[PDB]
Amino acid sequence: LNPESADLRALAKHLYDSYIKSFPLTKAKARAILTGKTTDKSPFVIYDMNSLMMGEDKKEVAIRIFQGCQFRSVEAVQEITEYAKSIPGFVNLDLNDQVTLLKYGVHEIIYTMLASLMNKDGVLISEGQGFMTREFLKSLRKPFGDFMEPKFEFAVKFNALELDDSDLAIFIAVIILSGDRPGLLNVKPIEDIQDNLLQALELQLKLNHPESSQLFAKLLQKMTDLRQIVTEHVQLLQVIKKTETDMSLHPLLQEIYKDLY
Ligand SMILES: CCc1ccc(CCOc2ccc(C[C@H]3SC(=O)NC3=O)cc2)nc1
Numbered sequence: 675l676n677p678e679s680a681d682l683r684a685l686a687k688h689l690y691d692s693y694i695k696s697f698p699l700t701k702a703k704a705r706a707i708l709t710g711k712t713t714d715k716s717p718f719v720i721y722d723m724n725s726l727m728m729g730e731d732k733k734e735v736a737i738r739i740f741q742g743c744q745f746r747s748v749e750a751v752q753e754i755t756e757y758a759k760s761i762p763g764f765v766n767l768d769l770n771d772q773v774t775l776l777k778y779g780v781h782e783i784i785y786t787m788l789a790s791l792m793n794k795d796g797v798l799i800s801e802g803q804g805f806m807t808r809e810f811l812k813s814l815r816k817p818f819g820d821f822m823e824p825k826f827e828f829a830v831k832f833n834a835l836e837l838d839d840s841d842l843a844i845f846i847a848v849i850i851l852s853g854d855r856p857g858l859l860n861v862k863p864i865e866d867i868q869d870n871l872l873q874a875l876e877l878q879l880k881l882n883h884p885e886s887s888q889l890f891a892k893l894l895q896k897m898t899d900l901r902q903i904v905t906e907h908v909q910l911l912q913v914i915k916k917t918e919t920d921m922s923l924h925p926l927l928q929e930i931y932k933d934l935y
Pocket of ligand 1: 742747784797800
């Protein structure tokens with residue numbers, strides 16, 4: 675019997691709803707696919723070149739896989755942007771700040787949600803219809819061989835927190851509404867929204883994970899891991915671009931990466 679708690683539950687429900695609406699492949703579906711539940715179908719597994727050419731029925735392989743990742747990332751940016759607009763207060767912010775928050779927030783969100791599609795052995799692709807093994811991704815030619823490893827390392831750790839979609843919905847909102855982003859014009863309105871989101875997240879985790887002591891704090895500490903993945907990725911990208919002068923980068927990703935840090 676607390677009305678402030680009641681408003682925070684209302685916010686949590688709203689965010690979960692928009693999340694399900696914005697992201698076509700949820701963690702719940704991903705885990706059904708990965709663990710072999712009967713609600714969803716088995717993926718075709720790509721573990722080598724033959725299986726890759728087989729899978730394509732249902733050029734340069736490293737470059738093909740890399741650009742696949744890129745294209746998937748641009749559609750993820752599109753999904754995250756539609757989600758962000760559902761976050762109460764976001765579209766009422768200064769437009770330049772909306773842009774800044776998306777610019778710095780989207781990649782940290784991509785890697786958070788990518789974890790949902792991963793286990794220690796590989797990653798779901800093509801909306802869960804495929805599974806590409808971690809060893810196969812590791813085996814790719816020099817510059818490409820290690821692009822995915824840091825993401826797998828983060829994911830195994832992150833997934834040990836056993837978050838569900840209802841938790842992740844609030845956490846990603848919290849990520850987007852970060853007042854510490856470089857070049858923000860009006861920090862106060864953003865921190866006010868984030869404070870509300872943090873209250874909602876704390877209550878969600880206490881209610882959804884009553885036996886998981888300090889899960890809120892542990893989750894927030896993962897923001898440090900996300901930030902480091904993004905930094906590493908950015909530097910790997912600059913190596914790739916200099917060594918592979920014939921590989922195209924999508925303009926949207928290019929604009930996001932422009933003087934990030
Ligand atoms: C169908 C082919 C295919 C094969 C591997 C993956 C794994 C996806 O892993 C990802 C890795 C990084 C990113 C985002 C990164 S990669 C890039 O070029 N730009 C980004 O922002 C997004 C996804 N997806 C699709």
